[PDB]
Design an enzyme around this catalytic site. Structure first.
Site, PDB file in Angstrom:
ATOM      1  N   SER B  92      27.175  29.821  11.405  1.00  0.00           N
ATOM      2  CA  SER B  92      26.307  30.149  12.179  1.00  0.00           C
ATOM      3  C   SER B  92      25.776  28.096  12.489  1.00  0.00           C
ATOM      4  O   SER B  92      25.516  28.270  14.111  1.00  0.00           O
ATOM      5  CB  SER B  92      25.217  30.712  11.494  1.00  0.00           C
ATOM      6  OG  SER B  92      25.236  32.047  10.916  1.00  0.00           O
ATOM      7  N   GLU B 216       0.847  34.268   0.376  1.00  0.00           N
ATOM      8  CA  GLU B 216       1.334  35.889  -0.107  1.00  0.00           C
ATOM      9  C   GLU B 216       1.832  36.240  -1.812  1.00  0.00           C
ATOM     10  O   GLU B 216       1.848  36.911  -2.107  1.00  0.00           O
ATOM     11  CB  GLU B 216       2.139  35.929   0.804  1.00  0.00           C
ATOM     12  CG  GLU B 216       1.884  37.392   1.453  1.00  0.00           C
ATOM     13  CD  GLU B 216       3.357  37.076   2.327  1.00  0.00           C
ATOM     14  OE1 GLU B 216       3.123  36.820   3.364  1.00  0.00           O
ATOM     15  OE2 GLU B 216       3.213  38.663   3.145  1.00  0.00           O
ATOM     16  N   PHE B 269       6.321  34.223   8.266  1.00  0.00           N
ATOM     17  CA  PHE B 269       5.541  35.122   7.823  1.00  0.00           C
ATOM     18  C   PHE B 269       6.000  35.557   5.982  1.00  0.00           C
ATOM     19  O   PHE B 269       5.668  36.608   5.632  1.00  0.00           O
ATOM     20  CB  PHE B 269       6.172  36.263   8.401  1.00  0.00           C
ATOM     21  CG  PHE B 269       5.903  36.166   9.978  1.00  0.00           C
ATOM     22  CD1 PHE B 269       6.026  36.174  10.746  1.00  0.00           C
ATOM     23  CD2 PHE B 269       4.725  36.559  10.101  1.00  0.00           C
ATOM     24  CE1 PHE B 269       5.314  35.572  12.137  1.00  0.00           C
ATOM     25  CE2 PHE B 269       3.528  36.722  10.896  1.00  0.00           C
ATOM     26  CZ  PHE B 269       4.483  35.454  12.347  1.00  0.00           C
ATOM     27  N   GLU B 270       7.007  34.521   6.161  1.00  0.00           N
ATOM     28  CA  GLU B 270       7.541  34.400   4.204  1.00  0.00           C
ATOM     29  C   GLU B 270       7.609  33.145   3.805  1.00  0.00           C
ATOM     30  O   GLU B 270       8.230  32.452   4.766  1.00  0.00           O
ATOM     31  CB  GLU B 270       9.196  35.491   4.228  1.00  0.00           C
ATOM     32  CG  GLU B 270       9.212  37.230   3.981  1.00  0.00           C
ATOM     33  CD  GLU B 270       7.741  38.014   3.287  1.00  0.00           C
ATOM     34  OE1 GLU B 270       8.011  37.218   1.986  1.00  0.00           O
ATOM     35  OE2 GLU B 270       7.475  38.392   3.539  1.00  0.00           O
ATOM     36  N   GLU B 311      16.567  36.165  17.292  1.00  0.00           N
ATOM     37  CA  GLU B 311      17.929  36.440  16.712  1.00  0.00           C
ATOM     38  C   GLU B 311      17.631  37.041  15.405  1.00  0.00           C
ATOM     39  O   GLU B 311      16.714  37.667  14.892  1.00  0.00           O
ATOM     40  CB  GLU B 311      18.182  35.234  15.893  1.00  0.00           C
ATOM     41  CG  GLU B 311      19.575  35.382  15.352  1.00  0.00           C
ATOM     42  CD  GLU B 311      19.696  34.232  13.868  1.00  0.00           C
ATOM     43  OE1 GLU B 311      18.944  33.554  13.249  1.00  0.00           O
ATOM     44  OE2 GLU B 311      20.857  34.342  13.512  1.00  0.00           O
ATOM     45  N   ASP B 316      24.068  39.616   9.905  1.00  0.00           N
ATOM     46  CA  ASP B 316      25.252  38.451   8.550  1.00  0.00           C
ATOM     47  C   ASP B 316      24.444  39.336   7.539  1.00  0.00           C
ATOM     48  O   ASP B 316      25.449  39.362   6.545  1.00  0.00           O
ATOM     49  CB  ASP B 316      24.438  37.692   9.789  1.00  0.00           C
ATOM     50  CG  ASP B 316      25.374  36.551   8.824  1.00  0.00           C
ATOM     51  OD1 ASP B 316      24.440  35.565   7.590  1.00  0.00           O
ATOM     52  OD2 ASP B 316      26.786  36.975   9.030  1.00  0.00           O
ATOM     53  N   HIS B 320      26.777  40.089   4.465  1.00  0.00           N
ATOM     54  CA  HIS B 320      27.959  39.885   3.079  1.00  0.00           C
ATOM     55  C   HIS B 320      27.353  40.095   2.302  1.00  0.00           C
ATOM     56  O   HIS B 320      28.491  39.964   0.849  1.00  0.00           O
ATOM     57  CB  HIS B 320      26.586  38.683   3.689  1.00  0.00           C
ATOM     58  CG  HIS B 320      27.136  37.379   4.499  1.00  0.00           C
ATOM     59  ND1 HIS B 320      26.107  36.185   4.803  1.00  0.00           N
ATOM     60  CD2 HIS B 320      28.918  36.711   5.425  1.00  0.00           C
ATOM     61  CE1 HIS B 320      27.136  35.299   5.624  1.00  0.00           C
ATOM     62  NE2 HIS B 320      28.199  36.180   6.245  1.00  0.00           N
ATOM     63  N   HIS B 358      28.788  35.307  16.001  1.00  0.00           N
ATOM     64  CA  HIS B 358      30.486  35.798  14.640  1.00  0.00           C
ATOM     65  C   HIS B 358      30.458  37.567  14.462  1.00  0.00           C
ATOM     66  O   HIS B 358      29.482  37.809  14.693  1.00  0.00           O
ATOM     67  CB  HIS B 358      31.143  34.148  13.476  1.00  0.00           C
ATOM     68  CG  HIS B 358      30.702  34.383  12.266  1.00  0.00           C
ATOM     69  ND1 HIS B 358      28.853  34.253  12.638  1.00  0.00           N
ATOM     70  CD2 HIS B 358      29.794  35.709  11.624  1.00  0.00           C
ATOM     71  CE1 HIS B 358      28.088  34.668  12.136  1.00  0.00           C
ATOM     72  NE2 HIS B 358      29.136  35.254  11.319  1.00  0.00           N
TER      73      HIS B 358
HETATM   74 MG   LIG Z   1      21.548  33.508  11.885  1.00  0.00          MG
HETATM   75 SR   LIG Z   2       5.135  38.191   4.582  1.00  0.00          SR
HETATM   76 ZN   LIG Z   3      26.143  33.856  11.661  1.00  0.00          ZN
HETATM   77 ZN   LIG Z   4      27.160  34.723   7.947  1.00  0.00          ZN
END
Ligand SMILES: [Mg+2]
Ligand SMILES: [Sr+2]
Ligand SMILES: [Zn+2]
Ligand SMILES: [Zn+2]
Ligand SMILES: *[C@@H]1O[C@H](CO)[C@@H](O)[C@H](O)[C@H]1NC(C)=O
Ligand SMILES: *[C@@H]1O[C@H](CO)[C@@H](O)[C@H](O)[C@H]1NC(C)=O
Ligand SMILES: *[C@@H]1O[C@H](CO)[C@@H](O)[C@H](O)[C@H]1NC(C)=O
Ligand SMILES: *[C@@H]1O[C@H](CO)[C@@H](O)[C@H](O)[C@H]1NC(C)=O
Ligand SMILES: [Mg+2]
Ligand SMILES: [Sr+2]
Ligand SMILES: [Zn+2]
Ligand SMILES: [Zn+2]
Lengths: 479, 479
Positions: B92, B216, B269-270, B311, B316, B320, B358
């Site tokens: 990436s 959080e 947010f995390e 994104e 992805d 994985h 990809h």
């Molecule tokens: Mg990415």
């Molecule tokens: Sr959160």
């Molecule tokens: Zn990727």
């Molecule tokens: Zn990947």
């Protein structure tokens, strides 16, 4: 290997500037297509195209992925949705109905609407849908079918046949009830449904009565004639036309292709499918590129133009075997045929489409280094501590367990033309895949090939470009 | 199921006639893009798009493959070649360099030419290549980065960062020698390299000193701050700008997005990556679609236009894991964000590109019936007499042997959100794949996206369309 020239941003910036310049130059035609060609890579999905590109690039003097295939040079690309009406993952017969007749059908039928049903002869009539090749002939064009399969196989049959069962190659295959009901075998349909100027590929055995020795294998009785009805379809086809010739070897094909006064040519080079390119006898058998050139010599004589169907038919067969070596070498020869046809025709008056009927569960992964062989091992061992290949299949006959374990593999093993890549699930044959495939187009009205389309769009854009079919009154100037 | 309407050829003939009509209407713009958006589906190859289409179609009231995704409605499609300079199957980071900076790079670097080397800090300087987002900012546009990953992850980092190692999220990750040599961690680069108007995604933990409780998860110490240098990068970023706000939950994000006078917005947010959509807490966390709308509210205020990067980052991550359920549900939410952005912007002045960095070794096979669940079993048993799934992987963590045999699978098992599809080869993580990916484009100069191109074309066409970058003196009329 890191190529030194590619370390400089200027290399990439120059290439991209050139690509933008070429993109800006392209302009739509206002004129019709005189000629139409569809190049069909059977089973040639996106992963196949990329892997073939790398192999072809390396067979030249290069690293691989940077070198364009001839198909990659076509300006217009679309994605094609391949589902059959009844099945998400399609077969070649019903996809043929879509890309050659412009209508989707049911799995394992050919040239029929989806009102028909597989293997039910009594659902045929009323459901025939006519191909754009048939429509081209009706408009006075010459027409040709070239393939590395049997000329009675599902893909080429889509150009001329209407059947509820793609397996009905000769009358020997058709059940007695269906013969009684008048469902003709595909070999019969080949000579009888429409006039075809050029027919080149495999399938000798379906044309001749049971007991007829094959000319090349007169001592292998399984390769002889299959027909139950006593008919010699080659002789019937020759009888119906002045200037017709039948050939069964390369030398005679090329001779016939140079003889004006031939006019109709049927060349059937094996009993069944043609040999894979890697097994081809170069004195006796024409390559796909050679068959396409022979076809073009004859078809190009007609001032009204031609329709030609060219199929890289055994790309599919390689994947079904899970032998990527065979799938990819067939793909390269297919791309060589595309390249050759582009040399012998003009994009000013010829609309050329390259596509596939469907894809395969073929993948290209691991993290191989630039320049490494596509048939090599992925860097690093798997979690079971054995090597694995960059090419793999989801399912098929490469699945092995030796002593209850996945086998290790070496580079010498993995690079062999008989090597079967491993899969997740053992099947006698690897399966087709359902994902969208590419359409590449060049020539008059090629700019209409765009976006994401139903596979039926292929037949329709071809009919429109040549002012056939339901698109007489296209609004186009002459070619 | 065979849908009755599709048995009539007229259905297909009508659809195709409509498709030809739409193809003929499309015309190139003579005007520039005011705004640019790139939607990046991380890992979203052709097989992912098709499988997501079927799932999304079924979640509506439909059979699946016939229903277009929002991305499928984009008029212009190209194929993109994803190889990195040093590796045929890319990562990436280096793909980001290609599609955001217009130059190919080496695996696991970001925003550098291929003169640089992975994990060698001393090869950085001189090799920085500037992103089109950076160039958009230089030209006075507002710019935004929205992702479901850490905002310091490889894809978003391509918009702003230059590093020889994508793993250097915070200073805790950078080796002492590289810190001494001045290689900045990505979190630092995020606040320091360029002004970014909107930053939305995960990655809280890299911004705060070791020991800082996460807001959080103040009782999970592993989720706290990572930094060794004592810095609070959020406070540094806020200090540098009037009208800046930092938010860490959904309610505050949406509030801030409605407040003129905000001007700069960072929402994290995390601690790390955001939750998968199927695990998202809808009171505390914004969906990708919600983050994209929040971004557009702020970015659209600038009369000079904007550049936005959005994104679908965890497509992805699903692959994985070999959990197609997660990959495909992330894909649907990504497509929902594309749809939403198209509602909030005009294709008259906004160039929108959807692509992937990809693909993955993900396949869709067997011969399933029309309308069947994508997460179901292939019809028919395998050669080992057990069931198998229509979705499979070439490699990855779905590979299992129970009692030395491939496990059987049921429909209830295969449809579970935790189910891992089988593969050929066991790995802790399934691998990326090397095949070409799609580019979909709409808006001013979108007609330039065509054919088969290097992945670098994405950055270049965007720069050209907006008259940035090396293409000031584009020859275009104003938006
Ligand atoms: Mg990415
Ligand atoms: Sr959160
Ligand atoms: Zn990727
Ligand atoms: Zn990947
Ligand atoms: C086709 O033939 C079979 C006879 O076995 C019959 O069951 C079916 O009804 C027939 N269909 C039509 C359309 O005649
Ligand atoms: C090719 O076919 C012709 C015509 O039958 C035959 O005379 C010739 O010997 C054939 N060539 C070979 C090598 O068999
Ligand atoms: C980078 O650092 C290492 C020191 O361990 C050295 O071997 C290499 O020569 C250096 N490269 C450059 C460009 O200075
Ligand atoms: C969201 O953040 C604000 C600002 O810190 C806080 O006051 C509010 O309670 C938060 N919402 C929730 C549900 O934690
Ligand atoms: Mg075929
Ligand atoms: Sr032969
Ligand atoms: Zn096929
Ligand atoms: Zn097949």
């Amino acid at each position: 290997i890191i190529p030194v020239e590619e370390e400089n941003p200027d290399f990439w910036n120059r290439e991209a500037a050139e690509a933008l310049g070429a993109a800006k130059k392209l302009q739509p035609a206002q004129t019709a297509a005189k000629n139409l060609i569809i190049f069909l890579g059977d089973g040639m999905g996106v992963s196949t195209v990329t892997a073939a590109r790398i192999l072809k690039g390396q067979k030249k003097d290069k690293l691989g992925p940077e070198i364009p295939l001839a198909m990659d040079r076509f300006p217009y690309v679309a994605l094609s949705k391949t589902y059959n009406v009844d099945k998400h993952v399609p077969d070649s017969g019903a996809t043929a109905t879509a890309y050659l007749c412009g209508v989707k059908g049911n799995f394992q039928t050919i040239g029929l609407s989806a009102a028909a049903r597989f293997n039910q002869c009594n659902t045929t009539r009323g459901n025939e849908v006519i191909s754009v090749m048939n429509r081209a002939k009706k408009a006075g064009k010459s027409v040709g079918v070239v393939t590395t399969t049997r000329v009675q196989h599902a893909s080429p049959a889509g150009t001329y046949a209407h059947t509820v069962n793609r397996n009905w190659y000769s009358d020997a295959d058709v059940p007695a009830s269906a013969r009684q009901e008048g469902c003709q075998d595909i070999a019969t349909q080949l000579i009888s449904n429409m006039d075809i100027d050029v027919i080149l590929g495999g399938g000798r055995k379906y044309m001749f009565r049971m007991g007829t020795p094959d000319p090349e294998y007169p001592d292998d009785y399984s390769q002889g004639g299959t027909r139950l009805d006593g008919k010699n379809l080659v002789q019937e086809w020759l009888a119906k036309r002045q200037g017709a010739r039948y050939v069964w070897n390369r030398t005679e094909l090329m001779q016939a292709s140079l003889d004006p006064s031939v006019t109709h040519l049927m060349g059937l080079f094996e009993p069944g499918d043609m040999k894979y390119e890697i097994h081809r006898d170069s004195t006796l058998d024409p390559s796909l590129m050679e068959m396409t050139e022979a076809a073009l010599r004859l078809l190009s004589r007609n001032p009204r133009g031609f329709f030609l169907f060219v199929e890289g038919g055994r790309i599919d067969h390689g994947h079904h075997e899970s032998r990527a070596y065979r799938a990819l070498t067939e793909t390269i020869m297919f791309d060589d045929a595309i390249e050759r046809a582009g040399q012998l025709t003009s994009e000013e008056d010829t609309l050329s489409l390259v596509t596939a009927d469907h894809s395969h569960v073929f993948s290209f992964g691991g993290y191989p280094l630039r320049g490494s062989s596509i048939f090599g091992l992925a860097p690093g061992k798997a979690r079971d501590r054995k090597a694995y290949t960059v090419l793999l299949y989801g399912n098929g006959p490469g699945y092995v367990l030796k002593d209850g374990a996945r086998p290790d593999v070496t580079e010498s093993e993995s690079g062999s033309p008989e090597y079967r890549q491993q899969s997740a699930v053992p099947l006698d044959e690897e399966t087709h895949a359902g994902e969208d495939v590419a359409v590449f187009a060049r020539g008059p009205q090629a700019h209409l090939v765009h976006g994401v389309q139903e596979q039926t769009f292929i037949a329709h854009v071809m009919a429109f470009a040549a002012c056939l079919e339901p698109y007489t009154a296209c609004d186009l100037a002459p070619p």
